[PDB]
Amino acid sequence: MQIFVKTLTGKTITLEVEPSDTIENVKAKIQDKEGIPPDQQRLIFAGKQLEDGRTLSDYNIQKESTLHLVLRLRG
Amino acid sequence: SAYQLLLSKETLNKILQYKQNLEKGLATPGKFFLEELSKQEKSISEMDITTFTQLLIQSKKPQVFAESQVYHDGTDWTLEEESILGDVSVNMPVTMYNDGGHGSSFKNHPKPISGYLAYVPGALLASGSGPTSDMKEVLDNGKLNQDKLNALYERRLLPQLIHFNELARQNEKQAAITIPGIGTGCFSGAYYDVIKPYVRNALIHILEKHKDSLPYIDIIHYDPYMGDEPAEKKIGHMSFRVSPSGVVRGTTGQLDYPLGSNPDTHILVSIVAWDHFSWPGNDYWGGARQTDDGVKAASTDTMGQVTGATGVYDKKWGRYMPPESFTKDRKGMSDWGDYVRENGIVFNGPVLALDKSGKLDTLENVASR
Ligand SMILES: *NC[C@H](*)CC(=O)OC
């Protein structure tokens, strides 16, 4: 299904996920499209940091939700 | 008194040029310099040369992507202002909490050590728009010109070497100076694959030329990480070591006493690869412990010297953090640049110039001569 990932600066990424996907897998999908190392990623949904081991259903992330990718921009 | 700005005689001439032409209406300030001028009350001709220089330095911003997000067109800074700002250096006493290793390679000092940092802007050979001032200066139709690069680094480094020669003498010690690959990273732009020998040659040229003025300088420890050969070179009385940490295992860190020095015999000074447009520490004002500038600022109390706040050192991440009274209940908006914004802190301190006789003096005095 569709979820949207969006940086503080407004860059938008679209991912193909399942509710069974773990946040680790989701950070790997972001690295796949953008090359951002999962180490540098903070994913925020509804004010909560998303723990690496939990799943997209744990946080009730459904189709076409928007996650927030908090990055610390590189020179 | 927490930090001291220095600049060369040639730079002072540039500043006098600029001030004279503004006074006549024949030059126009850049937007950021104009904002600083308009926050105070003196006209250009009413203010002395030191105040003028201070207000230009004050137009710097905490964090700037100097190689890609500066326009050199007067909407931020003009090239005339850029030419001056690139020559300004700043030194400060610091506590060094780790050896300055990048990433996760830093080693914490069991007892933090006392030393000094001297932030010096590298030759900026990268731009996201038009050519930079340094590009116009040291490139000849694209060719790097070693002699011109030599003159640029001499201009920018010598005032700090003169300063710390004198400081070593006053403390009845010698100076040990660690130097990184200044200007060799993102600053080198398209020259990244050729820049390394040019920088080492400039450092050797400066030391050879001014050896007679630096009797209390003892050890220079140059570490460009990769891309140069291990070496010791005797330059007069001085020992110049080329020790690239990616090439020589066990190299002492930039924020650590090089071999043959210790706190009882030497003051420890580290040159920081700085930039024209930022406050000292650049990237770490945005919380990033990245680049020589950001790493050394994060690994020292640089931010405390600049802001006057008492930070707290985080051993796990090798970072000097803002006060806990500030960061509590500020998650996501707690980095040092946020502290400066909310408190309206400005970058502005005492300034001296190196006169033709190798003495540091007020800008007014050096201009009189
Ligand atoms: N922080 C600036 C570095 C530029 C770069 O990554 O070149 C590829």
Numbering used by the authors:
A (entry chain C): 1 to 75
B (entry chain A): 41 to 409
In the authors' words:
ADP-ribosylation is a reversible post-translational modification involved in various cellular activities. Removal of ADP-ribosylation requires (ADP-ribosyl)hydrolases, with macrodomain enzymes being a major family in this category. Further analyses reveal DUF4804 as a class of MavL-like macrodomain enzymes whose representative members show unique selectivity for mono-ADP-ribosylated arginine residue in synthetic substrates. Crystal structures of several proteins in this class provide insights into arginine specificity and a shared mode of ADP-ribose interaction distinct from previously characterized macrodomains.
We therefore resorted to MavL-UbVME covalent adduct, which we managed to crystallize and solve its structure to 2.19 Å. We then tried to capture MavL in its ADPR-bound form through co-crystallization of MavL with ADPR and soaking MavL-UbVME crystals with ADPR. While crystals obtained from the co-crystallization trials turned out to be those of apo-MavL, we observed electron density for ADPR in one of the MavL-UbVME subunits from ADPR-soaks and managed to place ADPR within the electron density. Inspection of the structure revealed the adenine base of ADPR coordinating between H142 and Y265 of MavL through π-π stacking. In the other MavL-UbVME complex where ADPR was absent, R370 from the neighboring MavL molecule inserted itself in between the same two His-Tyr side chains. Interestingly, the same R370-involving protomer:protomer interaction was observed in MavL crystals obtained from co-crystallization trials that failed to yield bound ADPR. Thus, it appears that the arginine insertion contributes to packing interactions outcompeting ADPR binding.
